[PDB]
Amino acid sequence: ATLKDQLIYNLLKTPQNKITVVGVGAVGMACAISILMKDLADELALVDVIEDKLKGEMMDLQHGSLFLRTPKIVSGKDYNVTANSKLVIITAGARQQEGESRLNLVQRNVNIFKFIIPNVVKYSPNCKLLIVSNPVDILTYVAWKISGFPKNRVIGSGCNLDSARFRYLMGERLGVHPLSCHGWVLGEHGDSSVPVWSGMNVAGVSLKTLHPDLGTDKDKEQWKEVHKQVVESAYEVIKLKGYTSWAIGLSVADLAESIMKNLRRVHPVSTMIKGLYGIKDDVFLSVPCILGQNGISDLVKVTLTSEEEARLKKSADTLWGIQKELQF
Amino acid sequence: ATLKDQLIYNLLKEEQTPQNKITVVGVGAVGMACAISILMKDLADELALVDVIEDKLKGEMMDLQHGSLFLRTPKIVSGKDYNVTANSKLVIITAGARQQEGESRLNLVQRNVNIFKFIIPNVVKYSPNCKLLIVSNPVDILTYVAWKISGFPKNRVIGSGCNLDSARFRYLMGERLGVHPLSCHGWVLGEHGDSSVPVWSGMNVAGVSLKTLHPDLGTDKDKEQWKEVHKQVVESAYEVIKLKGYTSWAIGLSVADLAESIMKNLRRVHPVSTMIKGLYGIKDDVFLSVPCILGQNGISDLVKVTLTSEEEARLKKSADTLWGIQKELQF
Amino acid sequence: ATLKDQLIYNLLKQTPQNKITVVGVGAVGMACAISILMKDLADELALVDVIEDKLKGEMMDLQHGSLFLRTPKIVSGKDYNVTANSKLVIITAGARQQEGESRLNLVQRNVNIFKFIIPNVVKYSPNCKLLIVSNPVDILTYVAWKISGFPKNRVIGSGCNLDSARFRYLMGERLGVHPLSCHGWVLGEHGDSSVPVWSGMNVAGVSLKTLHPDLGTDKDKEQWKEVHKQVVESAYEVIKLKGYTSWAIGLSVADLAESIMKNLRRVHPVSTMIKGLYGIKDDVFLSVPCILGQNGISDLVKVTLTSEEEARLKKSADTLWGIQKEL
Amino acid sequence: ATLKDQLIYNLLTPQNKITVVGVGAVGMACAISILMKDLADELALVDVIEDKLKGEMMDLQHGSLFLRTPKIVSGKDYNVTANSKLVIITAGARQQEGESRLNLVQRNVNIFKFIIPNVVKYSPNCKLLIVSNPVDILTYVAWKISGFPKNRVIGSGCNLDSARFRYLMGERLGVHPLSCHGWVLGEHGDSSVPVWSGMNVAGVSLKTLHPDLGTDKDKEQWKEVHKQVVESAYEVIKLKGYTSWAIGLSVADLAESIMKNLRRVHPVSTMIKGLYGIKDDVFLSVPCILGQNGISDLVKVTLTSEEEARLKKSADTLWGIQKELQF
Ligand SMILES: NC(=O)c1ccc[n+]([C@@H]2O[C@H](COP(=O)([O-])OP(=O)(O)OC[C@H]3O[C@@H](n4cnc5c(N)ncnc54)[C@H](O)[C@@H]3O)[C@@H](O)[C@H]2O)c1
Ligand SMILES: NC(=O)c1ccc[n+]([C@@H]2O[C@H](COP(=O)([O-])OP(=O)(O)OC[C@H]3O[C@@H](n4cnc5c(N)ncnc54)[C@H](O)[C@@H]3O)[C@@H](O)[C@H]2O)c1
Ligand SMILES: NC(=O)c1ccc[n+]([C@@H]2O[C@H](COP(=O)([O-])OP(=O)(O)OC[C@H]3O[C@@H](n4cnc5c(N)ncnc54)[C@H](O)[C@@H]3O)[C@@H](O)[C@H]2O)c1
Ligand SMILES: NC(=O)c1ccc[n+]([C@@H]2O[C@H](COP(=O)([O-])OP(=O)(O)OC[C@H]3O[C@@H](n4cnc5c(N)ncnc54)[C@H](O)[C@@H]3O)[C@@H](O)[C@H]2O)c1
Numbered sequence A: 001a002t003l004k005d006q007l008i009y010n011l012l013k014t015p016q017n018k019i020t021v022v023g024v025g026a027v028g029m030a031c032a033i034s035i036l037m038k039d040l041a042d043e044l045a046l047v048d049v050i051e052d053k054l055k056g057e058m059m060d061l062q063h064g065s066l067f068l069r070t071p072k073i074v075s076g077k078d079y080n081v082t083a084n085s086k087l088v089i090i091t092a093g094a095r096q097q098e099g100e101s102r103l104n105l106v107q108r109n110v111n112i113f114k115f116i117i118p119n120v121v122k123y124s125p126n127c128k129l130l131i132v133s134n135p136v137d138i139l140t141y142v143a144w145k146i147s148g149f150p151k152n153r154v155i156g157s158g159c160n161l162d163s164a165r166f167r168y169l170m171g172e173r174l175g176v177h178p179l180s181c182h183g184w185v186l187g188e189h190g191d192s193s194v195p196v197w198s199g200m201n202v203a204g205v206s207l208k209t210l211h212p213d214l215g216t217d218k219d220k221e222q223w224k225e226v227h228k229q230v231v232e233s234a235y236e237v238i239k240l241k242g243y244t245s246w247a248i249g250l251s252v253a254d255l256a257e258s259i260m261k262n263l264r265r266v267h268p269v270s271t272m273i274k275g276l277y278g279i280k281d282d283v284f285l286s287v288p289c290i291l292g293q294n295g296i297s298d299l300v301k302v303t304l305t306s307e308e309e310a311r312l313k314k315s316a317d318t319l320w321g322i323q324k325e326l327q328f
Numbered sequence B: 001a002t003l004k005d006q007l008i009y010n011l012l013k014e015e016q017t018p019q020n021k022i023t024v025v026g027v028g029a030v031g032m033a034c035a036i037s038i039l040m041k042d043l044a045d046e047l048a049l050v051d052v053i054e055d056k057l058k059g060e061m062m063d064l065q066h067g068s069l070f071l072r073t074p075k076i077v078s079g080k081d082y083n084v085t086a087n088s089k090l091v092i093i094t095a096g097a098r099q100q101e102g103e104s105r106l107n108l109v110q111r112n113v114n115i116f117k118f119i120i121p122n123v124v125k126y127s128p129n130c131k132l133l134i135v136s137n138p139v140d141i142l143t144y145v146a147w148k149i150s151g152f153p154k155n156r157v158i159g160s161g162c163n164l165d166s167a168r169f170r171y172l173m174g175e176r177l178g179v180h181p182l183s184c185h186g187w188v189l190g191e192h193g194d195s196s197v198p199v200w201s202g203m204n205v206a207g208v209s210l211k212t213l214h215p216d217l218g219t220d221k222d223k224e225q226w227k228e229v230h231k232q233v234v235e236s237a238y239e240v241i242k243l244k245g246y247t248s249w250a251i252g253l254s255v256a257d258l259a260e261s262i263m264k265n266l267r268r269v270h271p272v273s274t275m276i277k278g279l280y281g282i283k284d285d286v287f288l289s290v291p292c293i294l295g296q297n298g299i300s301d302l303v304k305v306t307l308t309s310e311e312e313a314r315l316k317k318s319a320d321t322l323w324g325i326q327k328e329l330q331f
Numbered sequence C: 001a002t003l004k005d006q007l008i009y010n011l012l013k014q015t016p017q018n019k020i021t022v023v024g025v026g027a028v029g030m031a032c033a034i035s036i037l038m039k040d041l042a043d044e045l046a047l048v049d050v051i052e053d054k055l056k057g058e059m060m061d062l063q064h065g066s067l068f069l070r071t072p073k074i075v076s077g078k079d080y081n082v083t084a085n086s087k088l089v090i091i092t093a094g095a096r097q098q099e100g101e102s103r104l105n106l107v108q109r110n111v112n113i114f115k116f117i118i119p120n121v122v123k124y125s126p127n128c129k130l131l132i133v134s135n136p137v138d139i140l141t142y143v144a145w146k147i148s149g150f151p152k153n154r155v156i157g158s159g160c161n162l163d164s165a166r167f168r169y170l171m172g173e174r175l176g177v178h179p180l181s182c183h184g185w186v187l188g189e190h191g192d193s194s195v196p197v198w199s200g201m202n203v204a205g206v207s208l209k210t211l212h213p214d215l216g217t218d219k220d221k222e223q224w225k226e227v228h229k230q231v232v233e234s235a236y237e238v239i240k241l242k243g244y245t246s247w248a249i250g251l252s253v254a255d256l257a258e259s260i261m262k263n264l265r266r267v268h269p270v271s272t273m274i275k276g277l278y279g280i281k282d283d284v285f286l287s288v289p290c291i292l293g294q295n296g297i298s299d300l301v302k303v304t305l306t307s308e309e310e311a312r313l314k315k316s317a318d319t320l321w322g323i324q325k326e327l
Numbered sequence D: 001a002t003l004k005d006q007l008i009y010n011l012l013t014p015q016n017k018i019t020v021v022g023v024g025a026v027g028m029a030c031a032i033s034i035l036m037k038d039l040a041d042e043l044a045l046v047d048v049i050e051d052k053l054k055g056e057m058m059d060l061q062h063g064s065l066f067l068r069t070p071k072i073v074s075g076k077d078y079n080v081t082a083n084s085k086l087v088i089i090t091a092g093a094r095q096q097e098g099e100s101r102l103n104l105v106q107r108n109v110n111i112f113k114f115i116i117p118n119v120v121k122y123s124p125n126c127k128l129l130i131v132s133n134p135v136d137i138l139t140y141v142a143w144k145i146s147g148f149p150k151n152r153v154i155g156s157g158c159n160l161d162s163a164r165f166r167y168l169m170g171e172r173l174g175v176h177p178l179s180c181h182g183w184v185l186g187e188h189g190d191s192s193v194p195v196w197s198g199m200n201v202a203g204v205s206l207k208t209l210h211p212d213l214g215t216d217k218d219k220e221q222w223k224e225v226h227k228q229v230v231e232s233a234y235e236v237i238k239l240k241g242y243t244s245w246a247i248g249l250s251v252a253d254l255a256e257s258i259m260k261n262l263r264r265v266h267p268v269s270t271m272i273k274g275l276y277g278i279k280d281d282v283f284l285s286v287p288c289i290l291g292q293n294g295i296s297d298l299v300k301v302t303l304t305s306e307e308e309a310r311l312k313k314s315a316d317t318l319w320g321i322q323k324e325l326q327f
């Protein structure tokens, strides 16, 4: 008699909260570990083109199962392992080098998405797509176009990380935890991001009202340097360690939490902003969105100054110029 | 007239003294996995990172700091100088040479003994009352080395040991039986490596002895070949190294688990590297994994496992092999 | 337009995915609710009771703590339409023991309550798992299974999960080890006829019975039988002191709910139909270690019992069957 | 030797101790919330009703397997309280039918006259977190009796009022309370002040978008949201007889910042002498930076002439009661 038969009496012979991570590099694995440690999924699937690395990463995670509450960890080059995922996170692709723009990655990662997106949609037609690969705003547009999904189920990580870094720096300046420091960085996840100085507050006390020179060139405290630091942060980290991983992994797990738990929390994520701020094109960029079980259900209509709105329009114009030049 | 002064009214001068400080030495794949795991388990109010590569260290620290909004650890610091390490309750050593494909952990001994000669005195200088958690390989020998250099009592010197081996064994057991590893009980003791001992007698699900049900358990004449489960545990690191170049996630999770018991004074039983002199006929200062009670003072107690003649012989072989290497140690 | 319309632009104009219902909002129901809420097990919590004021007050109190939780929807109502598409339905409704009263003395008045509750739950959540807490839990799990017409896998009684948790707490206190590291099983009836499996008692896989052969024997100088007697009497002791038990059972239920909602496939001592084991030929429900996941009880662990242990379980089983057939 | 000696070979103070004084509905909700948030390595409970206290402690202890707090203690004697980092006061007299305001406040002062010296004796370096009503007056009372610096004396104050306000705001807008920002300050209860200027979603000022916000000339009547905060509090009492879960969660949130030295901003009762023209030793809710030394800083909120007057009236009324009190 088998030991299993002697020990266990079987009564009877489909995952409810499945998450897939595409690309098991530094970003993909940081997302995976953060999601597993937050108990967001009952099943985790991993996909990559490098079969050895993929099997090794899956095994390393599986060896930690005793310390996790995610009972099934799967991987494969074939997308059948991704079937019936509630959320699919795309982190596959070329990463920006020291001093290189994220916009220089566009043709390399567009070609990667041309293969990935149809495979993901085939096995999880009702999933939400969470794009992380750079340039995140353009690649969210690309994923939306290739998938044919409604705009609500296509989300780019966007400025959730930029806003998180801004709040970290704000917190460091004021001696307050980032959770209690409120500030929004919108638009392009990159060089043309927009700091909304008007919305900056601690305990609902407007920083701009207290200090009218906030973010202007008149400012003796040079608060504009906080946003420069945000723009330059990725470049700085890339210069020091070769890539960024932990902060984005944590930012993704935060977005995944609101989606998986249907929290309806407000996050700055890449979404289609056509019809807002005089944008007439199919441009994707970060604006505050209500995140839940159906992805982006609503958009917060931020009151911007004429200067803030102009900066956002410049960001959108730059992104559309790149987007027009794409063939699918 | 600053914005800070206009917004905030200060009641007290900055009275900095961290109550639950953790330090990670070595910010490679292992150190960073340990750091992220500890950060996501809210085990510390302060995290300190040390390395010899200053750029990598600054980059890693910054990457973690950029995630502060999503964490509940208000202070993350780093530096080449151990003054950043001051008053840590727990210091985790992950610095050093790692095995290449097919290389024994025992081949790393001279290289990492050489670096421990520098690290251990620096950690003890700034955190004299800390608990030391050794991860660097060979973990059993390096726990002995850390204990000898520090001059600390044996309770405050802990090696990660077979906590990971036992965890991998339970994962495989669980997969074979269709039960969560949490409900599958089994112990891998001794050397964190090739000479680890599977305690077949203690293997159970719901207190039901697997050896009693299947007397062939762990033997060569076993039709089910359960001895292969332990073989898979021994090879696991080699197979992962072959595939991705190193191991990181499972060890970081295993370290965070040990840190949880220490920081929270849980008094949970873990298979960790400790001095086993006086047990199983071992007369020498050998460090190897045995089940220990882990709390706020590190290892407070040892579980005296009843072993079969075969099991005890295997453990004695492990201890003999480790002492032979320890004997020749120059430091 | 409205401030809401000026501030928020709507994109989308769905069935609950991880819904849990708690029936009965008394001390037990509310302890289960708070435990489940703090463990992030559900995206929707529904509450049902017959006392409408108490139900509204409890719902509101929970809703006022929403900022500190990650369960976005908390609903309540006397009508079971609020319960629709629940993955798990927890029954805590009914009469509780008075000081010195047996759980078996609640059977007839709690059977009548179930005759009304179970058809209403099955109507709105036909594919749910039923988790019975109301006493006598073993008999009422049988009752819920009979009324629902559900397969035995989707009908679970909280059973000896709490008895085993209390046993491990006491074991831990005696040994100076965390209950997590102290292993021991209390099986059978959640009550006076529960069975301590002395053979399975261990720390780090080291058998306590092997080390101390007198374990759970009358001769035993350390009197380890007293740990089990303390387990039997625990509810009686707490009832005498505070009037009822709530926190420990809430935590125990949340633990069972975690295995079910997350499909963990952990082993728990829960009330299930044991027909076919230990010479039991009747439709008796009692605690045995079960594998708990998304389909409830998928498997049963076949514990090796001594002739005395098996006889005690059979006596427990005989007592329960006698009551069951008379309903 | 003993089984313990045969099994375990021995080789060899609480670092994160929390005390809850008063094991009523509030105290027990605080206890369960703190236990489920892993904030302490030791939990101590104190009350005057010895049976209820022992029963509550036991019920919690029986759930030890599901928790990560290795030691739960209780007792009428404050020696169980020794070396607590945080002491939470939820103890209080149950108001009688006739009772005047001063009658009720003096009865609670009489309770504090006994509690506060006993807590300070066993935990001289602890932070005091006052929950007992009237929270503003009793925080002042605790500060006076203890002799502690104002940073180590905190009143739960308006944290619950703000939490309820955000819940209602969230329900109006279809946004999670975490993403709805709004502050209710001043006197906890009927005389609380909604700061309309600070109300926002994603940093978008609601007052800027809708200038009639919180005024009487508002078609949307947002003033009703604050009325509902003051109103829902009475609604819970009428419906279930007390409030527990929301305040328990609110207190655990405050405890988290203190224990983990987070330096998060909370609306808590503190001494506001020197602000808004207040010249007396009055305790009111303002946003404070909470960490390992309690209140280290405060946020200087810009208030309207009306908002400033309300706070001044509140402070004048509180001081009038405070000078006629026997200590
Ligand atoms: N805030 C952000 O949005 C943010 C932050 C950091 C990095 N990134 C981006 O994330 C991406 C990845 O970063 P990284 O550090 O992990 O790089 P990486 O080199 O570590 O990993 C990329 C992985 O993608 C895999 N891959 C390539 N083509 C694939 C395909 N067709 N299918 C499946 N997998 C494929 C590679 O094999 C590799 O494992 C980059 O585009 C980077 O710029 C975004
Ligand atoms: N016990 C276990 O279960 C287990 C599991 C996996 C790996 N390991 C071990 O952990 C160690 C590290 O693994 P890894 O993958 O992180 O290697 P790694 O090369 O990626 O990282 C090693 C780090 O140590 C640093 N370092 C070297 N000398 C130092 C010094 N004198 N002071 C401070 N830092 C110094 C390096 O600069 C480097 O960043 C190895 O010894 C490895 O075998 C143990
Ligand atoms: N380990 C265990 O299994 C365990 C432990 C503790 C208590 N219990 C049991 O749980 C049950 C409840 O305990 P309690 O302390 O919460 O009692 P309680 O009186 O405080 O609560 C019972 C609730 O059930 C409600 N109720 C009654 N009939 C109902 C109906 N037809 N539909 C909906 N709700 C109804 C009541 O109105 C009441 O609110 C008891 O049967 C008790 O013995 C079991
Ligand atoms: N600040 C808030 O937002 C808020 C919210 C809800 C309740 N409350 C207040 O909390 C207090 C308690 O509420 P409750 O529902 O728990 O009341 P309760 O009557 O149920 O509990 C009070 C407890 O205090 C105990 N007690 C009385 N005197 C004592 C003493 N000298 N030492 C130790 N314990 C003593 C009682 O025995 C009792 O157990 C009340 O003052 C209430 O108004 C405050």
Ligand SMILES: O=C1N[C@@](c2ccsc2)(c2cccc(Oc3ccc(F)cc3)n2)CC(O)=C1Sc1ccccc1Cl
Residues within 6 Å of the ligand: D095, D133, D160, D161, D164, D188, D189, D190, D229, D230, D231, D233, D234, D236, D237, D241, D242, D243
């Ligand atoms: O939730 C709450 N419940 C309490 C209450 C309720 C209505 S007034 C006071 C509460 C608790 C227990 C008994 C109790 O008995 C009463 C009832 C009415 C009284 F006038 C005085 C005491 N009262 C205590 C309390 O402070 C709050 S919070 C709160 C109260 C009023 C307005 C706004 C807020 Cl946020």
